[PDB]
Amino acid sequence: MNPPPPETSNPNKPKRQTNQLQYLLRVVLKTLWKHKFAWPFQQPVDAVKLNLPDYYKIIKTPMDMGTIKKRLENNYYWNAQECIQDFNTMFTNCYIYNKPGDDIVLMAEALEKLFLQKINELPTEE
Ligand SMILES: COc1ccc(-c2cn(C)c(=O)c3cc(C(=O)NC4CCS(=O)(=O)CC4)sc23)cc1OC
Ligand SMILES: [Ca+2]
């Protein structure tokens, strides 16, 4: 079985919007989401459908851009660092689970490169 997906809201977690969080949704996530290689990362890994019975034996901190998108839309994060951590977790999971130089790894590496280019212009907190 698949695990439940990561939460995208939590009534006990303080919510916030900041201009860096806006930029993460409006520019960074937008750019990655529309990229040709986004598709394997737009939703939680369906280990059942993909026949990966060991995926969640190995990956205990799953993350995907669909979750990140909903979190941003829900103002789930307190700061940009929390969101950046989620992107980094998503990339890292892909590197942990897959052989180096598998096509999925190259895709994640391309998205990570673009991610860093886009966050290079993250605005100051105003
Ligand atoms: C909607 O279709 C997909 C949705 C998600 C994925 C996918 C996403 N992510 C993040 C992964 O890490 C991932 C890993 C996958 C995979 O098949 N890996 C195995 C084959 C390559 S390996 O031997 O390096 C490790 C085991 S499929 C997949 C692949 C899909 O189609 C191929
Ligand atoms: Ca392949």
Swiss-Prot record:
Protein's name according to its UniProt entry: Bromodomain-containing protein 4
Species annotation: Homo sapiens (Human)
Oligomeric and partner information: Interacts with p53/TP53; the interaction is direct. Interacts (via CTD region) with CDK9 and CCNT1, acting as an associated component of P-TEFb complex. Interacts with RELA (when acetylated at 'Lys-310'). Interacts (via NET domain) with NSD3, CHD4, BICRA and ATAD5. The interaction with BICRA bridges BRD4 to the GBAF complex. Interacts (via NET domain) with JMJD6 (via JmjC and N-terminal domains); the interaction is stronger in presence of ssRNA and recruits JMJD6 on distal enhancers. Interacts with NSD3. Interacts with NIPBL. (Microbial infection) Interacts with bovine papillomavirus type 1 regulatory protein E2. This interactions may serve for the tethering of viral genomes to host mitotic chromosomes allowing successful partitioning of the viral genome during cell division.
Disease as annotated in the protein's UniProt record: Cornelia de Lange syndrome 6: A form of Cornelia de Lange syndrome, a clinically heterogeneous developmental disorder associated with malformations affecting multiple systems. It is characterized by facial dysmorphisms, abnormal hands and feet, growth delay, cognitive retardation, hirsutism, gastroesophageal dysfunction and cardiac, ophthalmologic and genitourinary anomalies. CDLS6 inheritance is autosomal dominant.
Residues at the site labelled Acetylated histone binding: 98
Miscellaneous notes: JQ1, a thieno-triazolo-1,4-diazepine derivative, and I-BET, a benzodiazepine derivative, have been tested on tumors with success. Treatment with GSK1210151A (I-BET151, a I-BET derivative) has strong effets on mixed lineage leukemia and promotes myeloid differentiation and leukemia stem-cell depletion.
Highest classification ranks of the organism: Eukaryota, Metazoa, Chordata, Craniata, Vertebrata
Annotated function: Chromatin reader protein that recognizes and binds acetylated histones and plays a key role in transmission of epigenetic memory across cell divisions and transcription regulation. Remains associated with acetylated chromatin throughout the entire cell cycle and provides epigenetic memory for postmitotic G1 gene transcription by preserving acetylated chromatin status and maintaining high-order chromatin structure. During interphase, plays a key role in regulating the transcription of signal-inducible genes by associating with the P-TEFb complex and recruiting it to promoters.
Annotated compartments: Nucleus; Chromosome
Cross-link (Glycyl lysine isopeptide (Lys-Gly) (interchain with G-Cter in SUMO2)): 57
